Amino acid sequence: SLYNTVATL
Amino acid sequence: MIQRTPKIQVYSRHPAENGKSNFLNCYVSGFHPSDIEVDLLKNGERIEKVEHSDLSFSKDWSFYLLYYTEFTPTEKDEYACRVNHVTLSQPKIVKWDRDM
Amino acid sequence: GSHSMRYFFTSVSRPGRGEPRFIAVGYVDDTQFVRFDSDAASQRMEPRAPWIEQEGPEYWDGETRKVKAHSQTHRVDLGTLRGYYNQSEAGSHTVQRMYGCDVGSDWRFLRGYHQYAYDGKDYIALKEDLRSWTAADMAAQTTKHKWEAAHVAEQLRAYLEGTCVEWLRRYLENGKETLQRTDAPKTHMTHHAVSDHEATLRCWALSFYPAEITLTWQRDGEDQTQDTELVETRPAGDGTFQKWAAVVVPSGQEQRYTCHVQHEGLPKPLTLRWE
């Protein structure tokens, strides 16, 4: 299951 | 920017047996960037229905793909893979040797 | 044994040719189980292994929603990096991201990863402690500062140590037939006369899983490292792998040479000889 809270660069 | 040349292997899924159904594979790996052109050839001519795996990459970031099609090998038919990439000045052709 | 779950994401700008390409793939060990392709018709996360097809629409809708979010993030990042490196709008550029977790033979969290590359080289990575960042260059140091200030590592650590390994364990059990298996290599040797005074001996390993294998030649028990041609391990297309190792042997010396095969699926390492 994918990570839900990916931060932008 | 970084450019790495694809390694190429052409081979059958199963040990080749004349008149028995199989899959012809061309594995390209270790390349960057990801744009690449790969054809499978039967007696010099492009095979129409060729599929490929979903693009992925190794620990060193370099890409790999498997291109493949159903085929029934015979005594006389010759197969090859033809590859082009930014690192290649002209298409590179690798012949199928049923022993490699 | 030990196991891993890994997601790989590739983002490629296409100046003047529309939206950037985005491709996501997920693996458990050496088995792919999901994909998303920005260019495909469905615009959904899709199954690529039989065992995952059993998950319901809540699972597929959730992965589709998250994978779309990842796509949007990579879309924005391509622009940010172009500015960071003062690059023109003309060129195609590549962003790659990988993250996942390992569990040991006890099925407990062993290691987490989150790494990011731009145009084929390291950009930023989470350190082994999951608390700090390794910035590969000056530009990346900006990202490092931003992410440190926003405590980005902390929420990622929580995923890598917890949910990542919980889902890994779930997939291992649900896909037990496919994932908790080994296929031992089927082996054979070929002999091909090069000239009238040399022959190639090729040692084959076929139809094995997982991919990790050691194939070596010895002459009178001595390592033939520098004299062996060893191909990269390659997929068969059916979820197994293949590899071979060859040596050129002076005709009549075939007896001196032994091929040694080590693989998890073998009860004991194999020795093959041309006899």
Measure the CA–CA gap between C115 and C134, rounded to whole angstroms. 9
Which single residue is written with the structure tokens 């962003």? C95
DSSP state for residue C225 in the 8-state scheme? G
Chain B residues close to C78, C-beta within 8 Å: none
Question: Is domain C182-270 given the CATH code 1.50.10.10 in the classification?
Answer: no
CB-defined contacts A:C, below 8 A: 38
C-alpha dist (Å) from residue C115 to C42, C121, C134, C135, C148 = 28, 11, 9, 10, 16
Torsion of CA B51, B56, B60, B66, to 10 degrees: -20
Measure the CA–CA gap between B36 and B77, rounded to whole angstroms. 26
Domain boundaries, chain C: 1-181, 182-270
By the 8 A CB rule, do C180 and C170 touch? no
| Domains delineated in chain B | 1-100 (2.60.40.10)
In this structure, which long-range contacts are made by residues C82-89, counting pairs with CB atoms below 8 Å and at least 24 apart in sequence? C82/C13, C84/C139, C84/C142, C85/C118, C85/C139, C89/C15
The 3-state DSSP class for residue C209 equals strand
Give the chain C residue nearest A9 (alpha carbons): C77
Give the closest of C8, C190, C234 to B57, CB-based. C8
Q: Tell me which residue of C150, C142, C110, C100 sits closest to C124, measured CA to CA.
A: C142
By the 8 A CB rule, do B77 and B96 touch? no
Contact between chains at B33 and C10 (C-beta distance less than 8 A): no
> Tokens for C79?
């622009």
Residues sharing a CB contact under 8 Å with residue C76, sequence separation 6 or more, in sequence order = A8, A9
Q: At C37, which amino acid appears?
A: D
Q: Which CATH architecture has domain C1-181?
A: 2-Layer Sandwich (3.30)
Residue C85, CB-side half-sphere exposure with 13 Å CA sphere: 16
Measure the CA–CA gap between B29 and C257, rounded to whole angstroms. 31
CA B36 to chain centre: 11
Identify the chains in contact with B, defined as 3+ C-beta pairs within 8 A: C
Measure the CA–CA gap between C34 and C267, rounded to whole angstroms. 32
Q: List the resolution, Å.
A: 1.6
Question: What are the backbone dihedrals phi and psi of residue C8, each rounded to the nearest 5 degrees, phi first?
Answer: -125, 130
